[PDB]
Ligand binder design. Structure first.
Ligand SMILES: CN(Cc1cnc2nc(N)nc(N)c2n1)c1ccc(C(=O)N[C@@H](CCC(=O)O)C(=O)O)cc1
Ligand SMILES: CN(Cc1cnc2nc(N)nc(N)c2n1)c1ccc(C(=O)N[C@@H](CCC(=O)O)C(=O)O)cc1
Ligand SMILES: [Ca+2]
Ligand SMILES: [Cl-]
Ligand SMILES: [Cl-]
Lengths: 159, 159
């Protein structure tokens, strides 16, 4: 089962290359709880933004360029990223844009962090008709001393 | 001697009601570099924002209210925060606003991070007289894959 996880600003703006203008350790904890122990698919700008392999996860990099690092699996296509994963029950695709675009039609679940931030951007999360998907979980949180902005956690299941 | 270390958005903004909306790991590695093995003074609201005691430095909390944690030294005056530091060549003030205001006139050195972020803030760094300080180091950097905004590092020494 392929799942997408993403953190979206207002209008569905996503990162392109530079780090997003927010501080949300609570989203990073939600990211780790829901990816640990699973294989992760990412694109190359995602890679470098992390800057190291995620521990306790199988790191798969889908790119046309080439394997700088030995600690991660370098794949050139959709299908080879799929296979690199094995027979697991849940595959996490963690971004960026292009990567989302390519896995979504294949995807069964959406983990989304909806953040109350107005950011300028070219890239947006692919359009998904929330009518072809069921909200299974929704929880809002207010900004605080550690979290820069309000946020919403959401789980959607492809109906 | 005493030194102040601060991050400042445009117009000298140093604090919002919630977490600052930037992600600047560069700034934290500059902060640790410059504060390691020195005593740090802070106010309470900065302590609660860090979450724990900073590693490798002596933690001083400047507060009229009494202590919640055994791992740090709590002080109720500027002169007991000094005395508690001992015989160290340089004492680090770390914020927030009112702490910097009390310590300003005693400070000999400023380690400043200028961030190109336009934010409404709560608290501001005190107004200093720029003709009274000499820049002895400047370094600019653009936003990147890990840092949300451009910034510049400066050290100023009192003329
Ligand atoms: C830039 N990047 C991509 C990233 C960031 N937040 C997202 N948030 C969501 N919800 N979804 C994504 N796909 C997402 N991806 C990062 C950067 C750091 C960490 C990381 O350091 N995560 C630690 C948890 C935090 C910490 O160790 O400092 C983890 O083990 O997963 C993860 C992703
Ligand atoms: C809210 N806070 C106050 C803070 C933040 N940025 C600053 N930036 C500067 N230049 N000056 C300050 N006084 C400043 N103060 C923080 C929060 C986290 C850390 C912190 O975790 N720092 C690690 C470095 C980062 C990593 O190891 O997570 C450390 O050893 O100093 C320090 C200060
Ligand atoms: Ca100079
Ligand atoms: Cl990417
Ligand atoms: Cl404070």
């Amino acid at each position: 089962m392929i799942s997408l996880i993403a953190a979206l600003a207002v209008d569905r703006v996503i990162g392109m290359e530079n780090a997003m203008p927010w501080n949300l350790p609570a989203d990073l904890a939600w990211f780790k709880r829901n990816t640990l122990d699973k294989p992760v698919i990412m694109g190359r700008h995602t890679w470098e933004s992390i800057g190291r392999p995620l521990p306790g996860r199988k790191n798969i990099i889908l790119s046309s360029q080439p394997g700088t690092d030995d600690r991660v699996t370098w794949v050139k296509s959709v299908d080879e990223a799929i296979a690199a994963c094995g027979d697991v029950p849940e595959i996490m695709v963690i971004g960026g844009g292009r990567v989302y675009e390519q896995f979504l039609p294949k995807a069964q679940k959406l983990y989304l962090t909806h953040i109350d931030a107005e950011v300028e951007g070219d890239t947006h999360f692919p359009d998904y008709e929330p009518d072809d998907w069921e909200s299974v979980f929704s929880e809002f949180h207010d900004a605080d001393a550690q979290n820069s902005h309000s946020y919403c956690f959401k789980i959607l299941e492809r109906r």
